[PDB]
Write a protein that binds this ligand. Structure first.
Ligand code: 2VM
Ligand code: 2VM
Ligand code: CA
Ligand code: CA
Ligand code: CA
Ligand code: CA
Ligand code: CL
Lengths: 364, 364
């Protein structure tokens, strides 16, 4: 194996395939990247046995086919630490990989490519394409509502659901829920799968924000995303994800509209004097007015009064202010609509201007 | 006690005094700020029993004298979360402190001011003033060479030495040393004190890069710095500091000059394949050339060759790369000079264009 590649053609591929690579490999060789030269292309692979990231780099300079594996972090750091414009010449030399550029030289240890885990081929059952912006919107709208449990917990991940012409994400921890649906202009079979937290992070991380659209393939137990010259594959989480349709409040007839930024600032101040563990605040809704109160075991008290648009019946309701703040911070919009029923029912929150995301928060 | 002040006249003082407090107060009241109204002034004080931070704010609006203490972070967080231009109206009501602005209202718990630890008055023995930029330079030049939690408690601080018309800092951990001297235009008595790590951090933090000069007063067991209407006081470390004049190479015959960034990047690359515990690299110096090599126990090897300015006998010498890189990162200059004697002697490193900072690193 031999190749020479200009540094800035190697750097982004290395960064995308390296990470993670999350500190605790279950086999030593998983701390290495797999390098493969074949048919004019250098392929770079990183994996933790569950997810896999593969980058392909076209080789325009002289090269020789073959494969090896080298420590990912060290190889990345050597390439990154070389100056702008550096040509990076690599050759396999026995049990070492030699890296040369200018008058810099590095001999890295290798482990055989034949020993690197090769994840089984699988068959896609659903495929679609979408703009990167749409995927980014879907994830950012819901990601914060996933449970923070052990890795295999069924709610520690994001439901991805295809239905008609839309892709939908759902995330929940059993107390609050986020759901976002976006049309993608292709009619799709009914299907839903759970992508683990770590998979969700990589789907986001692979979005550069450019011309390149995203191509997604979903199988029985895996999902695959292609963008430009990169392919990411993740295992799915086994589990029965809850039905968001059953958690939306049936008749959230009482509608309050407020400026998102003023509402957020008011909740943020009140939160300071809320119970540090339970984070409870009380909302008092009345005609064109919202009153937010908080108190804590030290008998400290906060009160905020805001003008809002509201003309239904008065009511009082308790919420976890962190959950409410998470929603307002995810919305990043001018006005918010809070859709209320009564003191013992959940609230549904939406950008006043768009129903494409909804958030459900249970009262305390 | 009552006062009303604009948010923008309260925020900086609160940040100055409360910023240093951090989590884990050693006694509950040390989590509180002391507020005192007297003679048309609000004073705000935070302490950990050894250092103390006091800011004075002039009260132009109606006020009433008195004192209380309130949780520092909560009061600061409330003041910061209020909008720009908020009038902040404060009133003591029993064992609670009332804070009101617009339609935001808060009630904080108090602890009596009479119970707030008052640090003893002490007498100034050496006084001088200097620009903030100068103090910043002196600390940044040397801070990284301070020991970290060494049993030789005296090495965990920074020496401040007055000699002639210069203020000097020195820091060393027993393996490397940094010294910086700057003229300040006053005839100073010859004197030196050790400021503890936490005191150095606050000295740096209180700098704002405005026109306000820094006024320093040194006592037998304390130091005070005034900038504008802010006063920081720290205990000194009672111990005997090394004499930097004994550590500087007496006769470093071999001078090597090099681009700082080039040298730094070469060392940084070679460091990747240095022993992870001992971080040894070797330098081979010859006519206008420096070769750097690193190897580790897995038989990985790096080599870097640089064009540098050097005429003199050829020599080899080993260094901890981290110590060399710390210096090169501290210098922030175009060219560096390394002053060498032989393989068993320390090296002195300086900016090639200024002798105001010097660094000594022992060979391996
Ligand atoms: O029983 C339920 C009903 N439930 C449930 C979910 C949920 C989401 C929202 Br926004 C409101 C109510 C929801 C989503 C998780 C559902 C499940 O059992 O898989 C149960 N919730 C538990 C919370 C909980 C259930 C399972 C796991 C964690 C927390 C409770 O409030 O006692
Ligand atoms: O043998 C020594 C150890 N030592 C010591 C210091 C020092 C500084 C440098 Br750059 C190199 C070695 C140093 C300064 C700290 C001295 C002490 O232990 O009090 C000892 N003298
Ligand atoms: Ca495979
Ligand atoms: Ca929706
Ligand atoms: Ca005092
Ligand atoms: Ca000096
Ligand atoms: Cl507000």
């Amino acid at each position: 194996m031999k190749f020479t590649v200009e540094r800035e053609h190697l750097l982004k591929p290395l960064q995308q395939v390296s990470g993670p690579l999350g500190g605790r490999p279950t086999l030593p060789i998983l701390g290495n990247l797999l390098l493969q030269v074949a048919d004019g292309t250098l392929s770079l692979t990183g994996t933790d046995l569950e997810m896999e990231m593969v980058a392909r780099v076209a080789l325009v300079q002289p090269h020789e086919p073959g494969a090896t594996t080298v420590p990912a972090r060290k190889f990345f750091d050597i390439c990154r630490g070389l100056p702008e414009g550096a040509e990076i010449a690599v050759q396999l030399e026995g049990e070492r990989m030699l890296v040369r550029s200018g008058r810099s030289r590095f001999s890295l240890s290798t482990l055989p490519a034949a020993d690197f885990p090769n994840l089984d081929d699988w068959q896609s059952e659903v495929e679609f394409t979408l703009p990167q912006a749409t995927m980014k919107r879907l994830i950012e709208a819901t990601q914060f509502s996933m449970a923070h449990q052990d890795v295999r917990y069924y709610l520690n991940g994001m439901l991805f659901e295809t239905e008609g012409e839309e892709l939908r994400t759902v995330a929940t921890d059993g107390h609050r829920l986020a759901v976002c649906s976006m049309p993608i202009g292709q009619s799709l079979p009914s299907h839903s799968v759970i992508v683990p937290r770590k998979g969700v992070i990589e789907l986001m991380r692979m979005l550069d924000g450019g011309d390149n659209p995203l191509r997604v393939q979903i199988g029985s137990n895996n999902i695959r995303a292609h963008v430009g010259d990169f392919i990411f594959t993740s295992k799915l989480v086994d589990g029965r994800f809850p039905d968001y349709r059953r958690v939306l409040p049936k008749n959230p007839d009482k509608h309050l509209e407020a400026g998102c930024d003023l509402l957020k600032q008011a909740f943020a101040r009140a939160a300071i004097l809320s119970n540090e563990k339970f984070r409870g605040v009380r909302l008092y809704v009345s005609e064109n007015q919202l009153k937010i109160t908080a108190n804590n075991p030290e008998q400290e008290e906060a009160e905020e009064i805001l003008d809002v648009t509201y003309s239904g019946a008065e009511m009082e309701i308790g919420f976890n202010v962190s959950y409410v703040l998470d929603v307002l911070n995810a919305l990043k919009c001018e006005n918010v609509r809070m859709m209320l029923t009564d003191s013992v029912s959940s609230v549904q929150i939406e950008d006043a201007a768009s129903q494409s995301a909804a958030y459900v928060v249970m009262p305390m």
